[PDB]
């Protein structure tokens, strides 16, 4: 019943383990172990659920353990201890074969084949911890263990590809405790978390591991954002070193989102436009990455309205994301109709929701944008208009006040007008026929250059797999 | 054949409370007769919500009688011979009753059976039309859409022009029913040449509808000819009030008589747009869209005009014109400004090489984005 | 003007009639719109074929 299923579960892990072990221990074929390792994680997280979750326990018992046994006891202790033949090494089915690891020679210290198996165990535990939702004692114990465990080693490039996954759960576990629950000690250990990420980051340039380095930069930036240290983030990214080379397009989407967020609040919207569009493209558009997508699409809209661009009303409608973008929809219209009072009520009403995503502080700036837009509508509709008429139109208090809005706006070229004091009216000045001018030349030039860059990317990618294939024997 | 479409077209009017209360109660007479005669009883229950047990007792009776007759007839037909032709013909007839009572579900079962069995190509197309017609009765866009796709597989195998007329017009109602007019105009002007009333709203309706769509879609010459130099519309005169109003509009647009344009615009709203089930939903966009087309047209021929001039021509006050113009301008079809203090109306003139430049880059921009999206995808492999 | 038979514009507040005998817009730019136009259809097709690979 129990015995049967546990065993079965055990077997499956063991099969997977041996294969990836073989690959690494038979020369550097780097890509193959890596692709395999990612898929195995999914597979392992999916497995656990059924065939019983004491697959782990069984496997620990039956290795040449160093302190995995000591760890495992801590894990069973949190969630109530049992004993049913769980004594360390109560299972011997290794039986002096190198394959499942020669029992005698490992103990003596003439071989140490425990190395990567311990690393792998830590990965299985982390993974199992977050799946389960086991916290407190374990998280702390786990963080504790693994940091000195890694610093015992002097990692290989292949072993670093593997801790490129372990640090994401380390980060995330610390956060869960900090997020549940107020402590002075949370605050204190936030400092220590940064410090270690930063140490590992210097090392991963020298080790030549693009994968690890990327991951660390994602984490560190995210850390600056939560505690609201914008200044810290702005300094950190400008010693830019983030590679797009070896990294998943999953990782690219996260990276570019952080870029966008920090630009947003200091009023740089030109750079933020491009990075944001890219993260949308980059992201795998699937059922459970849908959370990411939603958060992002709320930002992308903000960035646009701040720039002065007006997002479609069509977009929010035909999306399957309608309901969440209900507040958004109200802002888009409110800027369009140029009604200040409605804008003011709208952000107050939505205050709680907006505040979570912290887009709220952007919304407050959107108060200027309402007014400014109303002054463009008036310029387009009526080329020559007495300053008296605008005041009535936008409900603005006196002649002197409208003087002051147009005057600040035309510095930015939004309205693109000039006030004629003498005559007591305002003249639009954008009057087209820029064909005759040198202007289209400028425009096309950028397009031409952009094509060329797409060519070089295309040419480059295409040829590379053939090279590997052609060399290899093939029928 | 006739009751199939007529019941629904007539009942619509009664539903509406848009219409005058007085008009609403006159519709009630006609609709009421046909509820009882045709025994519309399941559906009627639905329809009472939206605004004598005998009808229904009658239903139970009729149903049972009819059922009982045909039942053992079809049970006798099974003992007996021919299953291709004669049983298929009876199975059509069960569906005919089901279509009478307003259950779309029960007609669809029986009429499918006919298709299954190996039948004449001519016969095939026929049966599929009827299934799709059941959708119109309720007016559902999703059901109609999918059925009419199949009809095209068989349409050229049969290769009859008889049923392809019916096909053209069915797809026409599906289009009219939704906002898009581009497609409708093209099928519905053609139905002027050839109409078949079979399970289809009478020719007079088609005359009126063809004219509305006409205006919205074709440019000057072509459109004018299609909605005027048509022999058919002249022969048919103005026999009902609704066809009159729309034609009056057409005359005034074309003739550039802009005094009478506005009175004619208001008439078409009351008597064409709202009686129409199809353009009920689209009343709002349509009437507004006409004010923009007409204004554009006057402006095209004029470098500059006065507000006082323009205002007078239409028959609105000077203030009114300004307000209504300020709606049209940022949306952009008029291509114009108003230099207000002076009271002159200027019309920006970038129609030239500059125009062609601006358009061409935007189209280039659209191709550029698609290339990136696709590029990036393959590149990951 | 609207039929187009001298195809000019009437300037109402200056009460002058401007006449332009300029023929229809330059051919070259219009022919570009047709070329770019085809290319959009080429790309839609190219992505469906490429869907299998992704």
């Amino acid at each position: 019943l129990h015995h049967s299923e546990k065993k079965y579960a055990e077997e499956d892990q063991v099969q997977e383990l041996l294969k990836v072990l073989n690959e690494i221990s038979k020369t550097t074929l780097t890509l193959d172990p890596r692709y395999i390792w990612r898929s195995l994680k999914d597979l392992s997280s999916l497995r656990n659920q059924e065939l019983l979750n004491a697959e782990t326990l069984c496997f620990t018992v039956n290795v040449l353990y160093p302190d995995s046994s000591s760890f495992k006891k801590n894990l069973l202790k949190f969630i109530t201890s049992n004993h049913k033949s769980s004594v360390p090494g109560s299972a011997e089915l290794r039986n002096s074969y190198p394959a499942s690891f020669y029992s005698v020679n490992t103990e003596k210290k003439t071989i140490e084949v425990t190395a990567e198996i311990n690393c792998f165990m830590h990965l299985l535990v982390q993974l199992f911890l977050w799946d389960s939702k086991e916290l407190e004692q374990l998280v702390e114990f786990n963080r504790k263990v693994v940091i000195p465990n890694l610093l015992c080693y002097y990692n290989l490039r292949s072993l670093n590809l593997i801790n490129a996954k372990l640090w994401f759960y380390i980060y995330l576990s610390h956060e869960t405790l900090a997020r549940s629950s107020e402590e002075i000690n949370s605050d204190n250990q936030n400092i220590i978390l940064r410090s270690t990420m930063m140490k590992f980051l210097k090392i991963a340039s020298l080790k030549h591991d693009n994968e690890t380095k990327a991951m660390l930069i994602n984490l560190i930036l995210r850390d600056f954002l939560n505690n609201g240290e914008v200044d810290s983030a702005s300094d950190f990214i400008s010693k830019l070193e983030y590679p797009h080379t070896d990294v998943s397009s999953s990782l690219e989407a996260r990276y570019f989102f952080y870029l966008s967020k920090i630009n947003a609040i200091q009023l740089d919207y030109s750079t933020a436009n491009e990075y944001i569009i890219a993260a949308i493209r980059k992201a795998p558009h699937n059922s459970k990455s849908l959370g990411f997508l939603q958060q992002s699409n709320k930002l992308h809209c903000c960035i646009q309205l701040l720039m002065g661009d007006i997002p479609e009303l069509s977009f929010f409608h035909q999306s399957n994301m309608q309901k969440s973008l209900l507040p958004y929809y109200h802002l888009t219209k409110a800027v369009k109709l140029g009604d200040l009072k409605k804008f003011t009520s709208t952000i107050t009403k939505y205050k709680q929701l907006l505040l979570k995503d912290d887009t709220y502080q952007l919304c407050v700036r959107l108060r200027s944008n309402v007014i400014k837009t109303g002054i463009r509508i008036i310029s387009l509709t009526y080329k020559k208009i007495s300053l008296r008429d605008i005041c009535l139109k936008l409900n603005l208090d006196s002649e002197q006040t409208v003087e002051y809005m147009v005057s600040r706006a035309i510095r930015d070229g939004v309205i693109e007008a000039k006030i004629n004091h003498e005559d007591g009216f305002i003249e639009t000045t954008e009057l087209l026929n820029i064909y005759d001018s040198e202007d289209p030349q400028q425009v096309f030039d950028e397009r031409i250059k952009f094509a060329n860059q797409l060519h070089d990317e295309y040419l480059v990618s295409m040829r590379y797999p053939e090279d590997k294939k052609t060399q290899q024997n093939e029928k | 054949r006739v009751p199939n479409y007529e019941v629904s077209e007539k009942a619509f009017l009664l539903t509406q409370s848009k219409v005058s209360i007085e008009q609403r109660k006159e519709a009630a007479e006609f609709v009421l007769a046909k509820i009882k005669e045709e025994e519309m009883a399941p559906y009627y229950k639905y329809l009472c919500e939206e605004y004598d047990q005998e009808l229904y007792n009658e239903l139970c009776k009729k149903n049972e009688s009819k059922i009982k007759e045909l039942n053992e007839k079809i049970q006798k037909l099974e003992e007996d011979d021919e299953g291709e032709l004669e049983q298929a013909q009876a199975w059509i007839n069960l569906g005919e009753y089901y279509a009478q009572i307003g259950d779309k579900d029960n007609a669809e079962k029986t009429l499918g059976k006919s298709l299954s069995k190996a039948i004449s190509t001519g016969a095939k197309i026929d049966v599929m039309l009827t299934i799709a017609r059941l959708g119109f009765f309720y007016n559902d866009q999703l059901y109609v859409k999918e059925k009419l796709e199949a009809v095209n597989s068989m349409i050229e195998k049969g290769g009859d022009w008889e049923r392809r007329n019916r096909y053209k017009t069915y797809y026409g109602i599906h289009c009219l029913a939704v906002r898009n007019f581009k497609e409708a105009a093209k099928l519905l002007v053609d139905s002027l040449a050839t109409f078949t009333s079979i399970e289809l709203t009478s020719y007079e309706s088609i005359a009126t509808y063809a004219s509305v769509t006409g205006l919205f879609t074709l440019e000057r010459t072509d459109l004018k000819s299609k909605v005027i130099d048509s022999p058919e519309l002249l022969s048919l005169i103005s026999t009902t009030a609704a066809l009159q109003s729309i034609s009056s509009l057409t005359i005034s647009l074309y003739a550039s008589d802009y005094a009478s344009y506005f009175p004619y615009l208001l008439e078409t709203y009351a008597n064409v747009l709202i009686p129409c089930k199809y353009l009920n939903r689209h009343a709002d966009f349509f009437v507004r869209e006409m004010r923009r087309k007409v204004y554009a047209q006057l402006l095209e021929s004029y470098k500059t005009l006065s507000l006082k001039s323009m205002a007078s021509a239409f028959g609105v006050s000077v203030a009114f014109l300004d307000n209504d113009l300020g709606k049209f301008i940022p949306n952009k079809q008029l291509n114009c400004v108003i230099d207000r203090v002076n009271g002159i109306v200027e019309t920006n003139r970038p129609d030239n090489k500059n125009a062609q430049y601006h358009l061409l880059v935007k189209q280039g921009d659209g191709l550029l984005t698609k290339l990136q999206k696709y590029g990036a995808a393959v590149r990951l492999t | 003007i609207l039929d187009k038979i001298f195809y000019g514009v009437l300037d109402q507040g200056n009460g002058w009639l401007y006449v332009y005998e300029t023929p229809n817009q330059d051919a070259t730019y219009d022919s570009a719109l047709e070329l770019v136009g085809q290319l959009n259809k080429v790309v839609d097709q190219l992505f469906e074929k490429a869907s299998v690979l992704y």
């Binding site: 797999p465 024997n473 093939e474 029928k475 | 393959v378 | -």
Partner: peptide, 27 residues
């Protein structure tokens, strides 16, 4: 052409795999 080289490349992954099985018999 980008697409055409990638179809070819996908195909050859399978051929490379099977190649090994053929060599096993040969040895």
């Amino acid at each position: 052409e980008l697409m055409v080289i990638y179809i070819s490349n996908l195909v050859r992954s399978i051929i490379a795999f099977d190649d090994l099985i053929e060599n096993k018999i040969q040895n």
